[PDB]
Design a binder for this molecule. Sequence first.
Ligand SMILES: CC(C)[C@H](Nc1ncnc2[nH]c(-c3cnc(N4CC(O)C4)nc3)cc12)c1ccc2c(c1)S(=O)(=O)CCC2
Length: 169
Amino acid sequence: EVNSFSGYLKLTDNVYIKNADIVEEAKKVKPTVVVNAANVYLKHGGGVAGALNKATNNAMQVESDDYIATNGPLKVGGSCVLSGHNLAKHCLHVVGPNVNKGEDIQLLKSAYENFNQHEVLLAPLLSAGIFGADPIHSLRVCVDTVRTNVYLAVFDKNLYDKLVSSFLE
Ligand SMILES: CC(C)[C@H](Nc1ncnc2[nH]c(-c3cnc(N4CC(O)C4)nc3)cc12)c1ccc2c(c1)S(=O)(=O)CCC2
């Protein structure tokens, strides 16, 4: 079955959310697109990006280095489409702003706008965790910006509950 997402809560007509590890979701669902929470040089050193790269047994990092050699780094708010490897048909590498490193939070809208080139995506909550954005604000920008069908995997039950309660106010 194609894009067999299970156990998500529908927030709006095109945004769904689950308390889940994006890596485990990608292995089970094998979505058409999985979103990576990338940086501009596609160095998948830890967090979500490191976990997705490790699940490809480093094939994602080798492919990423070859893309950067030929094309140069991405811009903050930008993206590129590369292979999904064993996780998906394609991986959409999206660079959200890292507010802990001084990048502008307004670029989070540009980051989510990349999702609209793909009909169905499995994605993390951009710029959350160690990128420093307020995760409730990231969900609001997602809901207001994405018009295609997005399935958000948030690997923390405490944050999942706060996000759903924030949305349903
Ligand atoms: C908010 C937080 C709960 C969320 N975390 C996540 N959300 C969804 N799926 C996830 N899988 C993992 C994971 C991590 N490590 C291992 N590992 C196997 C072993 O080698 C370590 N496996 C899976 C974490 C994760 C989140 C969302 C966005 C961002 C971050 C974190 S970040 O990575 O801090 C910076 C980039 C933006």
